[PDB]
């Protein structure tokens, strides 16, 4: 299992060399190396049987993390006003982390989650960062609310899924209002264009059966032009005057690379001709693995070249690895196995460096020296899950899915904005529904692929790449909207 995933404790820790050229980047790096390596030195090797006397025990402190998320759950201090336009994210970070940690909400609490989120839904379409009487709809809280409804909701009259189903046409119309001719989307009325919006929209459109040709036109081209010379993806591409050329607008970054890989992956399910425009999968895989930090910085991921490692990149970068790997696999097959990143070291970074010091607030954090928060709790745990569980997109699972799909069952077709904006006919629409549903349910945990650093009490549940909700949430949720139950 671990021949090609050495423990940080088994490797020589050495600083990034200076080449006798000091700089601000190197000063910060050296300082961070010192901080992380010193915490590792104070902590017992999680892999040891002779769990060392005098040293900190690295076991995942699930109960502390649960208490951290609870206290944020039902009343937040005044300082949280900075996240008043991100309340659905607060919900998602909480409920998804609780799922990963194996902690159940009672039905009464789940009902409060559903009711809260329904008050964020506008009749005209989409969820905003707070109540519909206070905030306009936005692609990001639309993803966060939809996913949280998958986690906390159900098919009953008070379960929220029914309301989402009734909202399909309006959500679709919101997505079309966000659409730009070059294939990008604004995140909200008057808002920024970026690939996070594309990602959030494509996840929701996939889950709710509201994908159309007009919704997707140029969307692949926008995403593909986000890829930088480094192999990762920037937040956006700029269309020069449909466009004569498209150019990436910033650095390859973990967050935008995750969004671009996932968006591109979602598009590969869609049966349009010559669609989606290809990305350079080999380069994206290379960029991904290159972001894993050295032993001295604990084997955590950084978000961009020559910046610092940070626990949230365990999800953004580590969670993009199975996607990049699958795209590389497909490319190789179209011309014509060891782990692709250090799954052990990433777990060690999480357990040793990313957890709040014991006997305090709980929660997980960017790095030592930083306060934990809900966002870093969710993303550290999501990345931990990807490292513990070998995730594959399985062609034979997708084939089984196609075989069991019932195209005669479904919710009403979306009415396109433009007369010819829908699928050509029912054969094509149903084929599209089948492919999109079958591929969404194609991710599997490989048998015998589990690596739980530190022993089985550290095991968390399996998140799904691309979506980032548990497979046990994803399946009944997408089955509800496709009437496949």
């Amino acid at each position: 299992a671990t021949e090609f995933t050495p423990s940080v404790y088994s490797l020589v820790s050495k600083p990034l060399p200076s080449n006798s050229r000091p700089s601000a980047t190197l000063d910060e790096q050296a300082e961070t190396e010192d901080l992380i390596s010193q915490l590792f030195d104070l902590t017992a090797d999680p892999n040891a049987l002779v769990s060392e006397h005098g040293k900190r025990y690295s076991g995942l402190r699930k109960q502390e993390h649960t208490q951290f998320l609870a206290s944020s759950f039902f009343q937040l201090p005044g300082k949280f006003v900075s996240l008043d336009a991100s309340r659905p994210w607060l919900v998602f970070w909480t409920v998804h982390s609780l799922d990963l940690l194996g902690v159940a909400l009672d039905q009464g609490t789940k009902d409060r989650v559903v009711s809260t989120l329904l008050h964020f839904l506008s009749p005209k379409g989409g969820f905003g960062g707070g109540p519909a009487n206070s905030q306009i709809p936005h692609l990001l809280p639309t993803y966060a609310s939809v996913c949280s409804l998958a986690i906390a909701g159900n098919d009953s009259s008070t379960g929220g899924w029914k309301d989402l189903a009734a909202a399909r046409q309006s959500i679709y119309e919101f997505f079309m209002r966000c659409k730009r001719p070059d294939g990008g989307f604004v995140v909200c009325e008057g808002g920024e264009v970026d690939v996070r919006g594309t990602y959030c929209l494509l996840v929701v459109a996939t889950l709710l059966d509201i994908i159309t040709p007009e919704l997707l036109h140029n969307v692949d081209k926008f995403v593909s032009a986000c890829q930088t010379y480094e192999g990762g993806f920037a937040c956006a591409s700029f269309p020069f005057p449909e466009p004569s050329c498209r150019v990436s607008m910033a650095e390859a970054h973990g967050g935008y690379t995750s969004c671009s890989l996932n968006s591109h992956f979602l598009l590969t399910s869609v049966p349009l001709p010559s669609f989606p425009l290809s990305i350079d999968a080999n380069a994206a895989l290379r960029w991904t693995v290159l972001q894993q930090g050295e032993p001295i910085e604990g084997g955590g991921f950084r978000g961009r070249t020559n910046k610092l490692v940070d626990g949230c990149y365990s999800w953004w970068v580590g969670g993009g690895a199975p996607v990049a790997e699958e795209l590389v696999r497909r490319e190789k097959s179209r011309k014509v196995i060891p782990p692709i990143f250090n799954r052990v070291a990433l777990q060690e970074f999480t357990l040793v460096a990313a957890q709040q010091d014991p006997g305090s607030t709980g929660g997980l954090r960017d790095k030592p020296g930083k306060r934990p928060d809900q966002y870093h709790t969710c993303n550290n745990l999501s990345g931990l899950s990807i490292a513990q569980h070998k995730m594959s997109h399985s062609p034979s699972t997708v084939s089984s899915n196609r075989l069991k799909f019932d195209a005669s069952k479904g919710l009403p077709a979306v009415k396109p904005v433009a007369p010819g904006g829908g699928w050509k006919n029912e054969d094509e629409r149903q084929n599209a529904r089948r492919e999109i549903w079958a591929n969404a349910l194609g991710w599997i945990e490989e048998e015998g692929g589990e690596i739980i650093v530190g022993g089985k009490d550290n095991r968390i549940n399996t998140t799904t790449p691309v979506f980032n909700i548990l497979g046990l949430r994803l399946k009944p949720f997408i089955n509800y909207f496709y009437c496949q139950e």
Binding site: E3, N19, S20, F74, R87, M249, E294
Partner: protein
Amino acid sequence: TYIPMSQRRSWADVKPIMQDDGPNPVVPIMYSEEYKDAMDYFRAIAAKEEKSERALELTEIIVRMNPAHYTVWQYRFSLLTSLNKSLEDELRLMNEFAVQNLKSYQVWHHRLLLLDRISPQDPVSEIEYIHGSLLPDPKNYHTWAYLHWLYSHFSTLGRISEAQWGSELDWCNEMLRVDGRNNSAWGWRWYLRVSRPGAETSSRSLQDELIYILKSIHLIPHNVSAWNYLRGFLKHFSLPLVPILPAILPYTAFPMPSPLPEDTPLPVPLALEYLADSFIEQNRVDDAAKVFEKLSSEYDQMRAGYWEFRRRECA
């Protein structure tokens, strides 16, 4: 003490609207009296779609308390355009925001909208503003993306002169001199020299660029930014790796390496990567496999699995 808005003569005609969370909401935030009051009145203002000076003042009050409130920013920009307000004054206000540490993405996006609508014949002063804001915060991701947008937008309008492009490269060169490990400035160099539509591509252009890249590597051999740029450059222009190999070979053991600078332990893993890829270019797959094996087992063990994957690709 605070004066509630229900007691202000200027707001007497307005009936505030309460936040509608429903009963017993999750993730409720404890709000200051001031923020709750401002939002109760904003709800009323926005519901009736009032475009007025008092509404404009109210949006400033709110975004000063919560700079990330995208809804209130959207309403603010609607107000600026409806009232035909001075957009230059608004930019000055955004300048004042930065001085008062009121930064957020929404502030920068608001600047972008203002620049787009003002549509100045020459955007030099905003370029200089961006430069000044990067000096103390040199890797700010969204500031760099804004700089890319500004140049891209104004260049499609034909408003960036050759002198302007020239001074921009000079500024970029200085940023990389100050910190050669600044990947954001390397990304900007790529736009300036390679990706932008107006970039020159000639034999001398490629030559000059290669010289700059190799010199950068020789100055800081372990600098991942410079290696990735080298690899991106050769790939983009379909240039073979082999003819440059003499400049790289010393790191595996046109500008050539220095005695190497102190604190330069060998081998440099990305120099080995370059060597392996050059063997592959030559169809020498066994020799490439041998290098990948060494990267995997000895020289870059964090990526043992990846280098093993590359090794297996060869055999």
